[PDB]
Write a protein that binds this ligand. Structure first.
Ligand SMILES: Nc1nc2c(ncn2[C@@H]2O[C@H](COP(=O)(O)OP(=O)(O)OP(=O)(O)O)[C@@H](O)[C@H]2O)c(=O)[nH]1
Ligand SMILES: Nc1nc2c(ncn2[C@@H]2O[C@H](COP(=O)(O)OP(=O)(O)OP(=O)(O)O)[C@@H](O)[C@H]2O)c(=O)[nH]1
Ligand SMILES: Nc1nc2c(ncn2[C@@H]2O[C@H](COP(=O)(O)OP(=O)(O)O)[C@@H](O)[C@H]2O)c(=O)[nH]1
Ligand SMILES: [Mg+2]
Ligand SMILES: [Mg+2]
Lengths: 426, 51, 58, 431, 42, 430
């Protein structure tokens, strides 16, 4: 009764969404030929959240994939589950942005978004009561970060009274996989602060840390990291399509998590993840989920909550599990730890319990926690953008494409606003 | 998809390529040796012309 | 000297084990045939966000 | 979809191109006839109905003895006969003759053939023009070649590979005169111009490849691997890919500074690949060695702006990001202060091929480099003094004056080069 | 009945791990490479 | 995880490099072609083909010695880029190897050891072998010490040195080589050792029943000593010892880093048939000046520190039994300021004997490194020799012409004069 249209922006959007459609079609028992192979009648009770009907007893996803290089697009279908998409949903340009945010926001993306919004209006019309949209992208490139912000502003003005989910991969400070990487991020968070209901901060540096320290993977390519990212996208919105003893859908957390409209940047982490050697040595209980859910090892961002104050906290659980013990452990960590939590917001943590677990596993837990320590991601990015822009480096590939010289000072002053607005809540 | 999901499979397909490259470079060594023999008989040829 | 670039005929030894092509036939088809275009009239059902067509009695 | 045109100009252009095209057929399963015994070939080859591929190359020259062994060689039948463009009489080491007198006779014929290859393409990604700064055809005829493509083709990428004259070993006398006059045209009429020196390749081929007696066969085999590294992201899939448009924007800080430096690693012999373990962290330390650079400029005197990296083979993103962390910690390697995120990473899947009769080995994993240092101020200041030394008494100027250009083009080109050196002083200095 | 169900679930997990390891061994023993993945001269 | 980079310099260094690495091959069972038919990771490196390249760099200034290694039985085992050879040698001159010729190849090796150290995720300490007699082993080895201190700060640098003999010397300008390197190896050396050739000659004639030995039968004997030092780094024991440990419990002052090497038992295969080899009978043999490996007698001096390297079928039961009996005797003294002077290291694996060597099937062994005040006996003899030659301007014109001023002789002699006063105030009782 509540549907979400899926958006994947750029290359990094395309590999994330490809693994995401596999992990929930297995969760819904759906083959890439398209039909239904299930053992429970409850799976098909709520499948309309993400799917549409097709002739022959088949279900197709509600996704459209925007891109600016067709080589990335055809790699998606050659993989695991590429035959489920309608080919009309694919849309792509001819000349890439070349990791230039201005080129993907003024010069190249401005012609593609007329064709993209032809298909977005079609998928949004087939629903009956549209819950919202969802976006996946990365703030380190040009296609995902440049046009990905423009597609937000095209649909937010059109559809104001909706919800709008965005997954942002904030560029890691230490890998430096792009030279203009601070230029791309600073002009994009400018559009994620004023135009977006919901935005998550996942860092590729922390995704390397979890796969190296906890999972003990010898060679974790980007296929295994997209197993990490898409396990959070299922657990956040599992309340929309599976019934529970205590449920909390997307708008219930969206109201409760943000105290002020500018502060919608969160840090996920997931709890039951363990190595194969150490899985047989540890039991699964309610305290075992929450002892690892709040460790700084399992944060999915390059921020440490010990340096700051937790503003508001969420935790969404999964499995058949007792919620005296859930609320017992939740009060316990608030009472021992008396400095990292804000004093003017008592009973900080929001909580939900879902009956249906991920397959092959007893219990699971997901985390969405807003802390003051988000500002170190924001302040240290602002310092590298000031190092570039003071001696006027690399701006000729952005200024000469139709964009003025005062736009950066608009974005830097707005970025300086948010690092101090987060400071006065500390 | 099982091969993509596994990792010890990736270890084995990493090792077999090196096991291939060993034989390829050994045959390259043999090729270089026969080229050296050709250069030697060229030198003997030009010495005979000088005589 | 210019013959040395092609004196030797190809040998199956002098080739890598892996060959990963880049196939773009379907993307070429989607570039050849455009990315949809709306000339239809607005045909949508009227809907209310709480209930669709209640049954009011008495 | 991704398509590119190669324009090999001069004898240095043709001989480099033959080394490039022998290796591209090996990479794509092409017989010397041109037929196969999967649209990877579309980037350089055009597909006909008969299952034949024709390269998108134009071999242009002003003397026939360089081009006829292409016409009667083993690869005599792959190339279309009208791609091989021949002039009637050569420029004879004259920048003026190739620009003013001789090059104006066949330039109209070239531009029609340049037109007849771009209309076939559904979308153009870039150009490749290969030239040497020593001779006249590679300097003078290449000079007005760019200005015709710059006016005719608006913003299409035109990459350049240059054979800059070696600092002490040179084959000519008017060779410094050619290099000064050609920088005036490669400044305002080029998108990116790569830099390789001859004398560095001789030192690498001796010490590392264990070759006591090199020839241009071994030198041009090394150069063709560099373009094969760049084009491998066009032709074969990677974990993350870098296009020609990609590193064009991410390497140059200013429009006047588009002269990177190349480095290939590993450069080892087949008897020593048995010995050394070849990994990801080992090969990237050999990219920063001033001994293994492909340009005779020492980057320890200068400060790095940015580095473009291209890894090929069996390489994972973690080993790259681990080895980048090792390089940045050391004090012997410096970066400019207004560019902390200096690096750029390219990863591909298909390992490099080995040519028959070549001198490398079968390598599982290699690495290229397109780095930009402030060490290229020293390579110009020595050429500035050599050109000033000859031009002080006005030697060899009557040949250039009496052929179409007046006396003062040297005086304005010297001040352009003197102003271009001061750009490197002001950008490189810490503030 | 609760403790017997827990023992049953442990045995099922052990069987699943053995099955996945056996499938790993089988997919190592039989590797199939496409002719397009094969180089055309090779 | 532990790794150890070897460095060998000189014609002695290459000949002691080969004999040490020969028994290293039979200890781990590596064939001459580089392949087996994780103990070796401290000396060998890993390749995807399962090939093991040694972590050593031979350096020399003549082609006549490296070329025999390049065409020997182990021609494919050693890396060809690791055997750095010069073009013209210093020819028994410290100055030629220090100021003029040695500066040419100091740059290549310091790049070469960087490539092995970049392969080192953890490095225990460098080993250097050198001979004081030759110009390569004295001149370039002095700058090998000095640049290594700056390049790598506190990494361990152990040296096996070959001091000039008291009576039978291979060269005449050997005393000038000895004096001008001890000043360099004061402030640029972590730990040292000394072996003299007669002290090895006296063993093999008397104990090994070989009437006519060669450098083969010598260089195999130092190989038995170097193996036991790095033995516990390679194989576990009841309690082990690393390169860092036995260095710390031997040097009581930074100016004093000169122990004495000793090995026991050293017996023929015919004399291994008769004599029993217990734990007690091998520790008593390390105290004898007849079986000592330096021509100096500790009975004239005092032991300030001791170290022992047990190997084989040895238990802590018989270790503690013999040490008690040692301390009862009066012919062995200890300084009054070091009552607990002992350290004990115990290893499991017996030593491996090369086929064609000189020793036999042995089950128990010991290698002692006791620092004595009897090294000052040796320096008083050689400082007499350097004074007796430098008194009237002998062989000095060779050294001056390369570029070093004449005053460095008086610097390295008065530095040698202060070291005798440094070593005697340790030997006075409180
Ligand atoms: N690196 C490299 N440089 C080459 C090669 N062949 C020629 N050159 C350069 O070319 C310069 C001389 O020019 P030519 O080889 O005669 O060709 P050109 O530049 O077109 O000059 P012209 O023959 O007069 O037309 C020399 O200084 C070389 O530096 C080559 O195979 N490799
Ligand atoms: N203990 C020991 N010393 C040796 C051995 N071989 C050579 N030496 C020493 O080496 C010294 C002579 O120098 P060499 O090793 O022959 O040559 P070098 O050290 O390279 O010096 P240059 O010849 O000048 O380059 C003599 O004084 C010996 O003490 C050996 O096998 N055992
Ligand atoms: N989490 C994650 N990040 C990725 C992946 N691939 C690339 N990235 C990040 O994306 C950034 C580059 O973005 P890019 O792929 O160019 O986005 P595009 O411009 O839309 O194509 C780099 O900084 C990488 O850190 C992936 O598989 N997972
Ligand atoms: Mg010519
Ligand atoms: Mg010698």
């Amino acid at each position: 009764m509540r549907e979400i249209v899926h958006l994947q922006a750029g290359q990094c959007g395309n590999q994330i969404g490809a693994k995401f459609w596999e992990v929930i079609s297995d969760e819904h028992g759906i083959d890439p030929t398209g039909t239904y192979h299930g053992d429970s009648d409850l799976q098909l009770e709520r499948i309309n959240v993400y799917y549409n009907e097709a002739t022959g007893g088949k279900y197709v996803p509600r996704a459209v994939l925007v891109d600016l290089e067709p080589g990335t697009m055809d790699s998606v279908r050659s993989g695991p589950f590429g035959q489920i998409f309608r080919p009309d949903n694919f849309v792509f340009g001819q000349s890439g942005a070349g990791n230039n945010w201005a080129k993907g926001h003024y010069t190249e993306g401005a012609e593609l978004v007329d064709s993209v919004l032809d298909v977005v209006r079609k998928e949004a019309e087939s629903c009956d009561c549209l819950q919202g949209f969802q976006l996946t992208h990365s703030l380190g490139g040009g296609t995902g970060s440049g046009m990905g912000t423009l597609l937000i502003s095209k649909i937010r003005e059109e559809y104001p009274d909706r919800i709008m989910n965005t997954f942002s991969v904030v560029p890691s400070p230490k890998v430096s996989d792009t030279v203009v990487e601070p230029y791309n991020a600073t002009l994009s968070v400018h559009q994620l602060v004023e135009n977006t209901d919901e935005t998550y901060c996942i860092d590729n540096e922390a995704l390397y840390d979890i796969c190296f320290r906890t999972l003990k993977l010898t060679t974790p390519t980007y296929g295994d990291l997209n197993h990490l990212v898409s396990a959070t996208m299922s657990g956040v919105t599992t309340c929309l399509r599976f019934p529970g003893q205590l449920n909390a859908d997307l708008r219930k957390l969206a109201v409760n998590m943000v105290p002020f409209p500018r502060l919608h940047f969160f840090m996920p982490g997931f709890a039951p993840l363990t190595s194969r050697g150490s899985q047989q040595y540890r039991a699964l209980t309610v305290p075992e989920l929450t002892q690892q859910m709040f460790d700084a090892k399992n944060m999915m961002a390059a921020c440490d909550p010990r340096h700051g104050r937790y503003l508001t906290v969420a935790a969404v659980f999964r499995g058949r599990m007792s919620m005296k013990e859930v609320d017992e452990q939740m009060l316990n960590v608030q009472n021992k730890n008396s400095s990292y939590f804000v004093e003017w917001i008592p009973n900080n943590v929001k909580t939900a319990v879902c009956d249906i677990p991920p397959r092959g596993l007893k219990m699971s837990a997901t985390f969405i926690g807003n802390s003051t320590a988000i500002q170190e991601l924001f302040k240290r990015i602002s310092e590298q953008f000031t190092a570039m822009f003071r001696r006027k480096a690399f701006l000729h590939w952005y200024t000469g494409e139709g964009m003025d010289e005062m736009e950066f000072t608009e974005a830097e002053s707005n970025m300086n606003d948010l690092v101090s607005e987060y400071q006065q809540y500390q | 998809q099982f091969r993509e999901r596994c990792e010890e499979l990736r270890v084995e397909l990493l090792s077999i390529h090196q096991k291939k490259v060993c034989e390829e470079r050994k045959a390259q060594i043999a090729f270089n040796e026969e080229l050296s023999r050709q250069k030697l008989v060229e030198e003997q040829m030009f010495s005979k012309l000088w005589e | 000297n210019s013959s040395h670039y092609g004196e030797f005929l190809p040998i199956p030894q002098f080739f890598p084990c892996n060959y990963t092509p880049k196939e773009q036939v379907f993307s070429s088809h989607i570039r050849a045939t455009g990315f949809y275009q709306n000339n239809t009239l607005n045909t949508a059902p009227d809907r209310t966000r709480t209930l669709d067509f209640p049954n009011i009695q008495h | 979809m991704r398509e590119c045109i190669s324009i090999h100009v001069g004898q240095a252009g043709v001989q480099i191109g033959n080394a490039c095209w022998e290796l591209y057929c090996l990479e794509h399963g092409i017989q010397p006839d041109g037929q196969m015994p999967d649209d990877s070939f579309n980037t350089f080859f055009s597909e006909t109905g008969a299952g034949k591929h024709v390269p998108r190359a134009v071999f242009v020259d002003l003397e026939p003895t360089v081009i006829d062994e292409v016409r009667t060689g083993t690869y005599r039948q792959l190339f279309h006969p009208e791609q091989l463009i021949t002039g009637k009489e050569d420029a004879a080491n004259n920048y003026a003759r190739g620009h003013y007198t001789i090059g104006k006779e066949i330039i109209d014929l070239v531009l029609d053939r340049i037109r007849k290859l771009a209309d076939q393409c559904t979308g153009l990604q870039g150009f490749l023009v290969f030239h040497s700064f020593g001779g006249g055809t590679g300097s003078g005829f290449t000079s007005l070649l760019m200005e015709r493509l710059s006016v005719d083709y608006g913003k299409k990428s035109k990459l350049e590979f240059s054979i800059y004259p070696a600092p002490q070993v040179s084959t000519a006398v008017v060779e410094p005169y050619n290099s000064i006059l050609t920088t005036h045209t490669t400044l305002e009429h080029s998108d990116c111009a790569f830099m390789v020196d001859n004398e560095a390749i001789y030192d690498i081929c001796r010490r590392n490849l264990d070759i006591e007696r090199p020839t241009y066969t071994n030198l041009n085999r090394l150069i063709g691997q560099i373009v094969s590294s760049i084009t491998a992201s066009l032709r074969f899939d990677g974990a993350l890919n870098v296009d020609l448009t990609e590193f064009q924007t991410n390497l140059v800080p200013y429009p006047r500074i588009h002269f990177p430096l190349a480095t290939y690693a590993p450069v080892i012999s087949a008897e020593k690949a048995y010995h050394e373990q070849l990994s990801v962290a080992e090969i990237t330390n050999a990219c920063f060695e001033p001994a293994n650079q492909m340009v005779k400029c020492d980057p320890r005197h200068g400060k790095y702006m940015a580095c473009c990296l291209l890894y090929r083979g069996d390489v994972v993103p973690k080993d790259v990001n681990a080895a980048i962390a090792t390089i940045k910690t050391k004090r012997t390697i410096q970066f400019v202060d207004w560019c902390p995120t200096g690096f750029k990473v390219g990863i591909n899947y298909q390992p490099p091929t080995v040519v028959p009769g070549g001198d490398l080995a079968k390598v599982q994993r290699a690495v290229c480099m397109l780095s930009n240092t402030t060490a290229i101020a020293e390579a110009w200041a020595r050429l500035d003094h050599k050109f000033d030394l000859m031009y002080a008494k006005r030697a060899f100027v009557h040949w250039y004056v009496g052929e179409g250009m007046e006396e003062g083009e040297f005086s304005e080109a010297r001040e352009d080069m003197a102003a271009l050196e001061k750009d490197y002083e002001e950008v490189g200095v810490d503030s | 009945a609760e403790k017997e169900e827990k023992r049953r679930e442990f045995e099922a997990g052990v069987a699943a791990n053995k099955m996945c390891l056996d499938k790993v061994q089988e997919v190592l023993s039989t590797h199939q490479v496409l002719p397009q993945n094969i180089h055309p001269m090779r």
